[PDB]
């Protein structure tokens, strides 16, 4: 228990050092994204906002989508200070009709998107019996169904030119699960499944030019969940996540975990017995605001 | 290419007789389901139909749901020949309003469901750009969102009595992916995520009496997909799947793969490099009717 803690800390330290060593010994080649038309959904705040900043520094043409007009204009203002050409659109990324109508505007005013970042997301932390049905559907409408509509609208051009990049922002909740997040984990598993099946179908059809990347961070300090706490995982800073994402996109990395040492916990979750996984679970002590038993705890 | 077939044939034969050895050395205790109120969705045909037959032989009280009244009555007729008490209801298991209204009828006419089998499902095989948006939503409405509505309606009683069993019929498509099945794989990943997060939340809340099982089969000969063909996996007969499901429920098995040796391919998909996975993929030669490039291939 105390020694399990130290074991997990030493493995975390070994992974961190060894990965940093491989990044100097065998570095992956970075591609250029200058001049690419990058569409980022949920770009009005958090991961989407700081990912837009990274693409502005990379010299890409930006198309930012969000339901929050004020936020998306604040992001665009900063991207323009970084020297980027930005187009903002107020779009509900859970509404199919809104998505298709807005893609028509993007083609007319900007052109054909070459990099798509499906970042927009929502969460309503509560135990299954404290969830509202409307909140469950909204979670799927934004976290996964929106990915289908945007990808179907933007893929035709990418296939024609044999050139594109589809980034799916999922979560470690798309590989592992957390209590009081059943609809969220369910929708994030669907996002991982979509990325994996889209990657394979493109391979099967012989489409060599369209790359895919899946972003899977642990808790990030954006306010997405109120006051998160994990003993074994870090509460990430937004800029760190955006930096890891841009590094992964530029090197065509398919599955980007943040921090990369989450892979150790991923392997433990597949081979460890139930008793061992419950011991790690208690040590983790996950905390965050949620509605438990119809009361916000 | 050549030795690769017998390399996988060996890992299949070895698993088959090591599992049979563990079933004698460390046997799992089978529980009784006699007198339990078992609700099976999609019980009008295939896996749901033959699972109803297995529960009829187990002496449970059956509640069968399906959109096909003729088919669900044909299943009930056979369960009654097996000596079981069966109640049939025509329910759209993708329609939330229909689900809640029907749960009110089940409580009034039958009582409180203790075993829930979420089996109803749908598939529209096509490449992403040949899919219809209506087909994508229908896949999620039945394959995952219906699980949320039925489980939320039936869980309160199970928690009050600290006694229940939630069975999620997912697929190997909820762990691995197959091209031309992006919405299907995505919705099956969401079903696996729901089972895993439901299992953890019940554990976290101290609910010791509610068990969870997840049925993940390879292709089953039900007509669900047209003329399926797999070289390394068998095309399972429906009765085999129903037998494996009943054996897993009676021993409280959380993840039931059919055949159980799919676990070898599951581990190969996590540790083998891209080159080796594409070599096994070609050897697999998965075939089934699907709309490819707006043409039925
Ligand atoms: N924050 C975390 O702890 C965390 C961890 C893992 C994964 N993620 C994922 O990262 C993504 C971004 O989360 P974040 O932490 O940056 O959140 P955030 O709250 O900082 O920002 C999310 C943004 O998405 C926008 N958005 C919400 N619904 C939308 C809709 N219907 N249409 C358009 N835009 C919409 C919001 O307006 C907001 O600007 C999400 O997909 C989330 O699930 C977050
Ligand atoms: N057959 C396979 O190859 C296969 C493989 C893996 C997983 N599965 C899964 O097993 C489950 C059952 O498949 P099957 O092969 O037995 O199919 P099937 O087509 O033989 O039977 C499915 C049944 O579900 C019913 N159903 C469909 N939509 C419904 C709805 N809205 N409400 C109520 N009932 C509904 C149908 O009327 C039918 O009786 C599905 O979830 C499927 O995804 C099947």
Author numbering:
A (entry chain A), B (entry chain B): 2 to 298
Question: How is this structure described in the published paper?
Answer:
Here we report crystal structures of full length HSD17B13 in complex with its NAD+ cofactor, and with lipid/detergent molecules and small molecule inhibitors from two distinct series in the ligand binding pocket.
The nicotinamide nucleotide of NAD+ interacts with the putative catalytic triad of HSD17B13 (S172, Y185, and K189)23 and a long loop in HSD17B13, loop P218-T239. The adenine nucleotide of NAD+ forms hydrogen bonds with side chain of D67 and D93, and the main chain of C94. A prominent feature of the apo HSD17B13 structure is that the putative substrate-binding site is completely blocked by the C-terminal peptide beyond the helix-turn-helix motif. This peptide, N286-K300 (C terminus), interacted extensively with the long loop P218-T239. First, filling the pocket with the C-terminal peptide stabilizes HSD17B13. Second, access to the substrate site needs to compete with the C-terminal peptide, which may reduce the catalytic efficiency of HSD17B13 with any substrate. The apo HSD17B13 has essentially the same structure in different crystals, thus it may closely resemble the protein on the surface of the lipid-droplet in the absence of inhibitors.
